[PDB]
Amino acid sequence: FPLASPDLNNKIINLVQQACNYKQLRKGANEATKALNRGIAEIVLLAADAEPLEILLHLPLVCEDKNTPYVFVRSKVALGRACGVSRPVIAAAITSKDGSSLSSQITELKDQIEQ
């Protein structure tokens, strides 16, 4: 709600690993909120099993006000591993970058969120 499939979960995980190679990924709730406040967040990803739950209730509202798409993946552990870190991650943001070659895969995940 809006939760991934787990087709997408695996497709999101794939995009997340690319994002990391392109330096277009911000890992962690506060880093995600900073991307949203700078207007560079393209998609915000949230782990359905994150604690505290106030983050999970809270970040969607902030995304909505800022007109940024967001989607729930199943676990912080697979988000954390896709992020190239050995700890779980509760939220992440795929950021926009002027001239990026990822722009096409990003704008395509973005609209499959609509759906």
CB count within 10 Å of CB 79 equals 27
Experimental method: X-ray
Separation of alpha carbons 81 and 78, rounded Å:
5
Q: Is 38 helix (H, G, I), strand (E, B) or coil?
A: helix
- List phi, psi (to 5°) of 87: -110, 155
Q: Tell me which residue of 95, 52, 91, 96 sits closest to 73, measured CA to CA.
A: 91
Tell me the resolution in Å.
1.9
Q: Going by C-beta distance under 8 Å and a sequence separation of 6 or more, which residues neighbour residue 73?
A: 3, 4, 9, 12, 13, 45, 46, 47, 48, 79
Q: Could you say which of 3.30.1330.30, 3.30.1360.40, 3.40.220.10, 2.60.40.10 is the CATH number of the domain covering 1-115?
A: 3.30.1330.30
Burial (CB count within 10 angstroms: exposed 0-12, middle 13-18, buried 19+), residue 64: exposed
Q: Tell me which residue of 32, 39, 10, 50 sits closest to 92, measured CA to CA.
A: 32
